[PDB]
Short mmCIF file of C-alpha atoms in Angstrom, two decimals:
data_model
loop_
_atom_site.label_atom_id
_atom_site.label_comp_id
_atom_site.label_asym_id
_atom_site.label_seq_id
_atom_site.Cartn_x
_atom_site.Cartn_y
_atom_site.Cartn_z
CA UNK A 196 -2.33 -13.00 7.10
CA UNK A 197 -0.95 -15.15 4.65
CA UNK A 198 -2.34 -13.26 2.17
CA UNK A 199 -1.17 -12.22 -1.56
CA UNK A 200 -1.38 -9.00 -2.67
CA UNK A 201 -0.37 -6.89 -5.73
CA UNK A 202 -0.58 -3.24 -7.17
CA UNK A 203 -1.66 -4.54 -10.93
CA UNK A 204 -1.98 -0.51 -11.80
CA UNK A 205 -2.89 3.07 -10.91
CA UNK A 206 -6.23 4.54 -11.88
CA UNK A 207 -8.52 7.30 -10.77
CA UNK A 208 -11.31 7.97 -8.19
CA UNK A 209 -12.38 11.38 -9.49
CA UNK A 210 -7.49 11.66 -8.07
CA UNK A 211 -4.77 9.15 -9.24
CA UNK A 212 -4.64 6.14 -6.74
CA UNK A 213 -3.19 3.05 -6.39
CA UNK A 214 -5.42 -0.16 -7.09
CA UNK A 215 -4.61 -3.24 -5.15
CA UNK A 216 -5.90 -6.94 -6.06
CA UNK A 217 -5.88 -9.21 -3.02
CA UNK A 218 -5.97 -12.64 -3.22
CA UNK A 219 -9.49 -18.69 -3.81
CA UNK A 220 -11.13 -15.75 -2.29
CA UNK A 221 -10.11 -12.16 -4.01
CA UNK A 222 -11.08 -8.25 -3.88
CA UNK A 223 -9.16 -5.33 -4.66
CA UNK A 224 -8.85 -1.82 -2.93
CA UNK A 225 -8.15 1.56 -3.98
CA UNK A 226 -5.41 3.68 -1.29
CA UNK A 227 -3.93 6.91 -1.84
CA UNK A 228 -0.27 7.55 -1.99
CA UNK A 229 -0.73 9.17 1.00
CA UNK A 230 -2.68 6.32 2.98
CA UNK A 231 0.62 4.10 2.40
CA UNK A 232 2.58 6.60 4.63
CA UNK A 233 0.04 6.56 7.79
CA UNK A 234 0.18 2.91 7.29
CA UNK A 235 4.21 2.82 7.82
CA UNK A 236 3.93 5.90 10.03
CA UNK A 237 1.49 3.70 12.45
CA UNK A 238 2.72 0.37 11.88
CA UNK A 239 6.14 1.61 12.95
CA UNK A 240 4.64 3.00 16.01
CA UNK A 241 3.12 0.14 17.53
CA UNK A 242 5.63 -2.30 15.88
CA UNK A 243 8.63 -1.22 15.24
CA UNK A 244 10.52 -0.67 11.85
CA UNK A 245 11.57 -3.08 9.55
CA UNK A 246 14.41 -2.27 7.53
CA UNK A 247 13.64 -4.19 4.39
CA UNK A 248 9.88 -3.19 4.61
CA UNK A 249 10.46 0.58 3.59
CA UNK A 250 8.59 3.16 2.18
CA UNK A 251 11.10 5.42 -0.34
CA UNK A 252 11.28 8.95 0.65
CA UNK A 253 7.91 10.86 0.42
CA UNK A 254 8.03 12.84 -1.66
CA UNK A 255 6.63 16.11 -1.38
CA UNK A 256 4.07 16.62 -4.23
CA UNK A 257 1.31 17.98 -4.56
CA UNK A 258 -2.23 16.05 -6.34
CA UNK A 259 -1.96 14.85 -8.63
CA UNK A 260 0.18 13.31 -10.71
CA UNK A 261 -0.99 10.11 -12.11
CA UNK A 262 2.46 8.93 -13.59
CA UNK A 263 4.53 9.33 -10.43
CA UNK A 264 2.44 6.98 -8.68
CA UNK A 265 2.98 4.90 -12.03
CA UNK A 266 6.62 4.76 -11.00
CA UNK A 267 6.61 3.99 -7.18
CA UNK A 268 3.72 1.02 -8.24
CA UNK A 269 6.03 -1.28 -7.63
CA UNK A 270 7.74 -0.25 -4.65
CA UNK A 271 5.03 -0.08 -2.95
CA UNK A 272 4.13 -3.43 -4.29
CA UNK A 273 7.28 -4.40 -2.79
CA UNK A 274 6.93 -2.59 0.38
CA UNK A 275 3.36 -4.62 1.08
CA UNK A 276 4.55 -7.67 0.10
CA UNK A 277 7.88 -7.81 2.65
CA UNK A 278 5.53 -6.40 4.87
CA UNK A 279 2.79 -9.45 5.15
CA UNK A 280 6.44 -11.76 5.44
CA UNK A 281 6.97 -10.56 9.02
CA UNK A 282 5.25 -12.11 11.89
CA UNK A 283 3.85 -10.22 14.13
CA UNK A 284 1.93 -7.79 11.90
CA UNK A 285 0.41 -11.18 10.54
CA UNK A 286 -2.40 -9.99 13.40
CA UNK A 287 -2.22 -5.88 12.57
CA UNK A 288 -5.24 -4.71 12.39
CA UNK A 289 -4.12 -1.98 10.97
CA UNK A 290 -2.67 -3.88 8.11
CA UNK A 291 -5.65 -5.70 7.43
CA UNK A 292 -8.04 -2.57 7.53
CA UNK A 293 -5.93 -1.28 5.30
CA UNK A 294 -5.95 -3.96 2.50
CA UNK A 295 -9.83 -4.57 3.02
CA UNK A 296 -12.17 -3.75 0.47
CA UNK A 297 -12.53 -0.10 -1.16
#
């Protein structure tokens, strides 16, 4: 996985989520704030934990609101990118599920 990813925005699935263009092949997918925290919850479990590569706190909303996932966009931009840096998830398949298309 040396692939390049970004969270250009949030939009809705009607449900705010976050839409991710990856990249010259390209796609995007569409996860939900929650999804991001099974990811790290998982990863973690069969790989470790990266400091660096760190969700913020979870935060303990409730759907929906559309402009706090506005504000952790790029965080969790962030947290995706750092994350594809490492080694060793370079062959997670539960990365690459995860930033596959839809």
């Amino acid at each position: 996985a040396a692939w390049k990813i970004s969270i250009p925005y949030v939009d809705f699935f009607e449900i705010p989520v976050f839409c991710i263009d990856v990249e010259p092949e390209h796609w995007s997918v569409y996860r939900r704030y929650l999804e991001f925290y099974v990811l790290e919850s998982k990863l973690t479990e069969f790989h470790g934990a990266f400091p660096d590569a760190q969700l913020p706190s979870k935060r303990i909303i409730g759907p929906k609101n559309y402009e706090f996932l506005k504000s952790k966009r790029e965080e969790f931009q962030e947290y995706l990118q750092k994350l594809l840096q490492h080694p060793e998830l370079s062959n997670s398949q539960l990365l690459a599920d995860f930033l596959s298309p839809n």
